[PDB]
Structures are given as structure tokens and as C-alpha cells.
């Protein structure tokens, strides 16, 4: 009986592919290939944040564009005052294996997670003087890859046990479970309305979900390898995608298909982090070959090279005002350019 | 141009980084090892004098001049390519092989072939522990080892079978900067901490010689 259902699914996916093909008239070529080039972009080393004694695996910027959170394998979560190259807090972690970190938009909470399958939240503004654990969220059967804050009470985490979950910090329960993504969900990005988010996984799929619902609405496809990074456009209608096949793309929510792809012939290392500028014109992509090169989100052009990392870059971040970019590698030193 | 609050914030930062340096000095003298193997391959009883501290299991004990830490990495059913780079700076990888299970022997061989040629494990040495040798030698009369490993000749003795298994395990090694340490041990063998200590100090000496341009 499953043969008829499989045939119906094959007919539906053939119709979907035909619809994407027929909607792909006046395509990515010669629609954005009519404007001026971005030019030459060179960023000098303004800051070199030091203080970790292990590999930095994550980094998130504050919404004041003043404070950073870097969580590393040494069991330490240092909160950095970037304007003066300064340390504000140092939170000893119970489990040193960490693959993600978050910063609440209010500036009050930071999140952390890793191979302990626990998203542990921390409270910075306390009337005791030190950062304490506020709640330990457990219930996944796999490691957590990326956590992003919606407000002071709701967290959404992407984990490697083929699921994503939205929690509430007060009671520590999974309000919404986002089933799908047969591979391991490896990244997550929030649109600038706290309503819809994207999530890539190892099974080469970039689904789009809704927070107020519990199901997908657009399943982008087209990568031939693993995914590692994802990032929305400032409009809220597009997103980028970094992957293990040295291929960073731009996708389109309205068209339900794939816009221009910025890949290079000589590059073979995987992409670990992608990020967008304030206007969305400049895309910064991390690279596993000890480098982090910039591109253009409209045309294919290597506008510049940001070099200086002794090890692999695993976290890249652009502030809300877009004033500075943070680049963190496994050399225990993370850099801020201009 | 610095204010009073700025000065006291700089002092707080100095205290934070001094405590960070103290913690890094304290934690550098701990040997980190990565236990591996098949299901029920003797990982839970590698050392009978260990204290235990889910995603992964961490167990620690102290022997002579060094403090040991073991990562069982059990229950991590996810893809074994996304969190291996977390365990890239381990000094040694303890692989446990159970000679008793003939069905799961090829699973252990496949795992050994996977981990001994990974990009993150090109330099990390491996301390083999051919566990469960007593009942293996007890059952070596009925089973001649050719039911699971063909293309060999021998007297179906314990020594030759152990040598053949060890040779098959070392045949999956393709690296000029790594040495596999093999040590047959019993389930009643209390002498396991000294084997790991000798192997680990030999590994550290070998790594120091490698880094200086020597062997």
C-alpha cells in the first residue's frame, strides 16, 4: 500500500520541481547583473580579544553592539566589553564541551550548550554580584548546535537528534517540537520579526518554520553535502547558507527556489559561519582553510580577504548596527575588524 | 582618559584573567583520553579504581604524578564527524576490543579503520586493550577463529590467534607519526593503571621528540 503513497509523493514533488522551474523566468542572471560592483573592502585588525586557553567554538553579539559572549572548550564563558577590550564576567561551565552560545536581546541572559545535551541559561543582572545558573533545560537525545533568544523567557535550540525545540525558561519544558530534518540540525537563524526561523541539517535541507505554529512551510533543497551555517536577510524574505562543499548560496522565500550562488573553483574547505551586513549587501563567510572571505550577496565577487587566524574559524558575527564584525577561530583568540 | 569606574572595571578584568591563568595552569596537568569500542566491549571496567563524574560520561582517577580523565562517549548516536574535533587534543585514544564476541569483531575492526585514518586522529596514538582474554582462551577450543576471520593458517592456539588479531588491527594503521600500543589484559587484571601510565608517558615523550624535529 506504500507504493501508491510513494507514487503520489513523487508526483507532488515533480509538480513542485516543475513549478519552481516555470517560476524561474528572468532568473538570477541579468536581474542583479546590471548595477555597480561593491568594490574593494579591506578591514584592519582593530581588536584581538585574548583570554581563552582552548578552542573557541561559538560567539554571539549583544544587541547594544557593545558586549560579546564567547564560549569555548575550556569550560569558560567570557563576556567581553569590545570597546575597551575588556572582560565583564567569567562563568565557569559544568561541562566544558560547548558548541553554542547566545545573548538575550534585553542584555539580561546568556545561553550555552554542547555535548551534555543541556541548554543552560545564566542570569547576568542579579542582586548577588555573580552570574548564577537560572535554569538547566534538558530533554533532547542529542547535542545542541545553535540556540537563539526570542525574549527573556523563550529560547529555541537546534540539536543533532533530528529535532528542534522551543522552550520556556520558567518551567523548563518543550512547548513546541519541530519534527523533520532526518540528518543532524546544524544551524539556526531568526528573522527580524520573531515569527519565522530557518534551520539547516546534515541531510542537505534548509527548512523554514513558524514560531506560532509547529510545522514547516518551505523546504529549500540543492546542497550536495553537509550544512553548517545559516543567516536571514535584513528584509526578512531571504537567507544565506554555508555548507561543507565550499559553496555559499543565497535563497529566496517568495520564489521557493535558489538565487545566486557564490562558489569558487579552487576552494574546497567547508564553510563554518556566514553572516550578512546591515544592508544585506555584504556577506561574510567563514572558511575551514584558516580564512574568512567576504562576498557580495547580489553578484559573485571576492571583495576582500580577512586573514590572520592560526586555526579554523567556527564563529562569525556582525552587530545589529553593522559597525564591526567579530571573527573567532580555534587559536584561542577571536578578532574584531572594522 | 580613564574614569574611576573604568579603573575598577580594569581591576576586575585583571582579577578575572588572573583566575583564568590559574585555572589553566591547574588544568594543564591532566591527561585526557578517549575511550572507544563496540557495545559492551569492556569500556565500563577499564580501571577498577576510578571515580565517576546523558551525552557523554567522564571518569577520572589519579595515578602517581598525573591525573587521568576518560571520556566514554557512549550514547552519542549522532554523526561521528561533527563532534570529533572536540576530542582533537586528546593525548591518546584507548580502544577496547572484546575477543569473546565473534559477531561484533568486524564492527570493532570497522570502527578502528574509521578512527585510525581520520583527519583529526592522524597523530593521536592508540592504546589497544584486547580485553576478555580469559573466556576467549576458554572458548578458543570450540571456535577456531576462521569462522570470523578467514585467509590464515595456524595451530588454533591462543598465542597465534592473539597475534593474528593484533596484526589485523595494526594492518588498518596508515600513519608515519603514530604507534599503536597493544597490551592483552584480563577481566581480573588489577594492573591496568600502570599500563596506561607507561603508555601515556611514552606517548608524551614521543610527541615531544616529534615536535623538535626528531622521531
Amino acid at each position, epitope marked *: 500500500e506504500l507504493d501508491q503513497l510513494r507514487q503520489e509523493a513523487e508526483q507532488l514533488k515533480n509538480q513542485i520541481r516543475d513549478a519552481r522551474k516555470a517560476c524561474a523566468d528572468a532568473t538570477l542572471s541579468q536581474i542583479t547583473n546590471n548595477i555597480d560592483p561593491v568594490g574593494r573592502i579591506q578591514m584592519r585588525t582593530r581588536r584581538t580579544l585574548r583570554g581563552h586557553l582552548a578552542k573557541i567554538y561559538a560567539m554571539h553579539w549583544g544587541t547594544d553592539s557593545r558586549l560579546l559572549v564567547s564560549a569555548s572548550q575550556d569550560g569558560k564563558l567570557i563576556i567581553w566589553d569590545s570597546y575597551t577590550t575588556n572582560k565583564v564576567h567569567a562563568i565557569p561551565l559544568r561541562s566544558s564541551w560547548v558548541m553554542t552560545c547566545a545573548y538575550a536581546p534585553s542584555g539580561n541572559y546568556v545561553a550555552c550548550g554542547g555535548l551534555d545535551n543541556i541548554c543552560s541559561i545564566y542570569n547576568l543582572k542579579t542582586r548577588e554580584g555573580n552570574v548564577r545558573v537560572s535554569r538547566e533545560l534538558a530533554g533532547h537525545t542529542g547535542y545542541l548546535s545553535c540556540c537563539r533568544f526570542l525574549d527573556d523567557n523563550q529560547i529555541v535550540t537546534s540539536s543533532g537528534d533530528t529535532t528542534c525545540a522551543l522552550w520556556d525558561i520558567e518551567t523548563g519544558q518543550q512547548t513546541t517540537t519541530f519534527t523533520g530534518h532526518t540528518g543532524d540540525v546544524m544551524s539556526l537563524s531568526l528573522a527580524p520579526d520573531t515569527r519565522l526561523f530557518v534551520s539547516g541539517a546534515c541531510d542537505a535541507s534548509a527548512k523554514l518554520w513558524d514560531v506560532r505554529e509547529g510545522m514547516c512551510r518551505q523546504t529549500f533543497t540543492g546542497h550536495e553535502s553537509d550544512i553548517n551555517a545559516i543567516c536571514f536577510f535584513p528584509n526578512g524574505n531571504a537567507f544565506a547558507t554555508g555548507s561543507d562543499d565550499a559553496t555559499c548560496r543565497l535563497f529566496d522565500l517568495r520564489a521557493d527556489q535558489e538565487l545566486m550562488t557564490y562558489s569558487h573553483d579552487n576552494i574546497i574547505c567547508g564553510i563554518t559561519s556566514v553572516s550578512f551586513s546591515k544592508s544585506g549587501r555584504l556577506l561574510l563567510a567563514g572558511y575551514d582553510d584558516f580564512n574568512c572571505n567576504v562576498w557580495d550577496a547580489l553578484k559573485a565577487d571576492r571583495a576582500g580577504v580577512l586573514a590572520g587566524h592560526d586555526n579554523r574559524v567556527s564563529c562569525l558575527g556582525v552587530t545589529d548596527d553593522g559597525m564591526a564584525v567579530a571573527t573567532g577561530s580555534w587559536d584561542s583568540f577571536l578578532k574584531i575588524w572594522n | 582618559t580613564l574614569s574611576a569606574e573604568d579603573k575598577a*572595571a580594569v581591576e576586575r578584568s585583571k582579577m578575572i584573567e588572573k583566575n583564568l591563568k590559574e585555572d589553566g595552569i591547574s588544568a594543564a596537568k591532566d591527561v585526557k583520553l578517549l575511550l572507544l569500542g563496540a557495545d559492551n566491549s569492556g569500556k565500563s571496567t577499564i580501571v577498577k579504581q576510578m571515580k565517576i563524574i546523558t551525552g557523554i560520561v567522564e571518569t577520572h582517577f589519579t595515578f602517581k604524578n598525573l591525573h587521568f580523565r576518560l571520556f566514554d562517549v557512549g550514547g552519542q548516536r549522532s554523526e561521528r564527524k561533527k563532534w570529533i574535533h572536540c576530542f582533537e587534543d586528546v593525548t591518546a585514544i584507548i580502544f577496547c576490543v572484546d575477543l569473546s564476541d565473534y559477531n561484533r569483531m568486524h564492527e570493532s575492526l570497522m570502527l578502528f579503520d574509521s578512527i585510525c585514518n581520520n583527519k583529526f586522529f592522524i597523530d593521536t596514538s592508540i592504546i589497544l586493550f584486547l580485553n576478555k582474554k580469559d573466556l576467549f582462551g576458554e572458548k578458543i577450543k570450540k571456535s577456531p577463529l576462521t569462522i570470523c576471520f578467514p585467509e590464515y593458517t595456524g595451530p588454533n592456539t591462543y598465542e597465534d590467534a592473539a597475534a593474528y588479531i593484533q596484526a589485523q588491527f595494526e594492518s588498518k594503521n596508515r600513519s608515519p607519526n603514530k604507534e599503536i600500543y597493544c597490551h592483552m589484559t584480563c577481566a581480573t587484571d588489577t594492573n591496568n593503571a600502570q599500563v596506561i601510565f607507561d603508555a601515556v608517558t611514552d606517548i608524551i615523550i614521543a610527541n615531544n621528540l616529534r615536535g623538535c624535529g626528531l622521531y
Partner: single-chain antibody
Framework: VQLVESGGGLVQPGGSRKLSCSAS????????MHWVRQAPEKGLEWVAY????????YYADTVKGRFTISRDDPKNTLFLQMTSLTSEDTAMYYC??????????????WGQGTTLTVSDIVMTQATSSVPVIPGESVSISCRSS???????????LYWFLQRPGQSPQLLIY???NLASGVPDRFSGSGSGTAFTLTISRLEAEDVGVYYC?????????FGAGTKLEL
């Protein structure tokens, strides 16, 4: 979180006393604790200071060479050892906690004082007997000998409310930042050497004396005090 200060009492004009205060509820080593005295019918005055981990110890002009401050971090106790007690030291001695990082709120908790009996920047604020009506717009002013703005973009001026029979409580820090637990009616604004606390819709539990503080140059300067009547 509660600070209890013990000791004090009568002393001969030339003797010595060693006041001590203890904390129970917050991490002591992360806070730079202060000593602030209050004459029985006058304003507040800064006395002593010790940093986190005893890394910096500052004294006042009337405190240098005569007093000393120490803290016992393992036992969570702050010590004030005073020598050559004159008759001008007859004051109630307050223990004040303070933390310093980006976004901190220094001088956010005060301990109940110790009555002692022995038998720069200049700031002068407003009037001292203003007729507060319950429910109004009251603009308590302040002044300074300098424009208290640094290159960091932070203007430093603190507002304290002393209820009758109670220790001072922080209301506004930096220049316009509400402290935690302060209701939204309290609001402050100003510029260099011109500061005003605009209290709108005055209510109960607001009568008392209002104080300023500078925190650019470290020897602390208060104001005389503006008192809300009725």
C-alpha cells in the same frame, strides 16, 4: 543580602575604636566596599574604601594618616580601624557595597549605621525646606564644581533618598539610569554641572532628604540635602 555593622559607642577624646561590618547574602570578594559617615544633624561624607581583593585602598582628606580599612574575605568581614578619635568623628558610619563593570550600579546597598560618640569637587544643591505637595512635579536641582562628563560618554551623578530613620537608597545612577526596585515616577536628566531629578506624581514613602554624588574624581562629594515636607 543584608549588611550588619557592629561596634561603636563612647570613646575618650584621643582613644581608638575599630568598627567592623559583615555581609551575608552576596559574594563579598566581588564588591568594593565603602565607609560613609553621617553627622547627627548634617549630610553625608565619604570616609574609606577598599577594592575587590584589597587591590586599591583610598582614604579621605580627613581620613588619610589616621584611619585604616581592612577586609577579611574568607570570613566575609570588613574592618575600619580608627586612631586618634577627635570630636569631629561623632557620626553614624554606613557600610556601602559597590560593583564595577559595564552596566553596573555602584552604591546600590547600604547597611544600618553605627552611632559613634566621642565626648576637589564642591557640590551644593537647591533649597533645603521645599514645600512638597502630595502629587505634583518637583524638580530637585544639583550643582558641581566641574562638568562631570568623561570621554566614555558616561556622565556620572548619583541620586540618594534618605527616608526618616533609614539608610540611604540609590535611585538614579550614571545620569538617567533607574536603579532596580525604584518606581517609574523617578526620573533624572541634565548636562554638565546641571542636574535635576524630576519627580512627577509624588506619593507617600518619598519624604526625606535627597543627595547627590560625583564619581569621576574619586574623593567623593555629596550635596547638603533637599528635604521634602508634608
Amino acid at each position: 543580602v543584608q549588611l550588619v555593622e557592629s561596634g561603636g559607642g563612647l570613646v575618650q577624646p584621643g582613644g581608638s575604636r575599630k568598627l567592623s561590618c559583615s555581609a551575608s547574602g552576596f559574594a563579598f570578594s566581588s564588591f568594593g566596599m565603602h565607609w560613609v559617615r553621617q553627622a547627627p544633624e548634617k549630610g553625608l561624607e565619604w570616609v574609606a574604601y577598599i577594592s575587590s581583593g584589597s587591590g586599591t585602598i583610598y582614604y579621605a582628606d580627613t581620613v588619610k594618616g589616621r584611619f585604616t580599612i581592612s577586609r577579611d574575605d574568607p570570613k566575609n568581614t570588613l574592618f575600619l580601624q580608627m586612631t586618634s578619635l577627635t570630636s569631629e568623628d561623632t557620626a553614624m558610619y554606613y557600610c556601602v557595597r559597590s560593583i564595577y563593570y559595564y552596566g553596573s550600579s555602584p552604591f546600590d546597598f547600604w547597611g544600618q549605621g553605627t552611632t559613634l560618640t566621642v565626648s576637589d569637587i564642591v557640590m551644593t544643591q537647591a533649597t533645603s525646606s521645599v514645600p512638597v505637595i502630595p502629587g505634583e512635579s518637583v524638580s530637585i536641582s544639583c550643582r558641581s564644581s566641574k562638568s562631570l562628563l568623561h570621554s566614555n560618554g558616561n556622565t556620572y551623578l548619583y541620586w540618594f533618598l534618605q527616608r526618616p530613620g533609614q539608610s540611604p537608597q540609590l535611585l538614579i545612577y550614571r545620569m538617567s539610569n533607574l536603579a532596580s526596585g525604584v518606581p517609574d515616577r523617578f526620573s533624572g536628566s541634565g548636562s554638565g554641572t546641571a542636574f535635576t531629578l524630576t519627580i512627577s506624581r509624588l506619593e507617600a514613602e518619598d519624604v526625606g532628604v535627597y543627595y547627590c554624588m560625583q564619581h569621576l574624581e574619586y574623593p567623593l562629594t555629596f550635596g547638603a540635602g533637599t528635604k521634602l515636607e508634608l
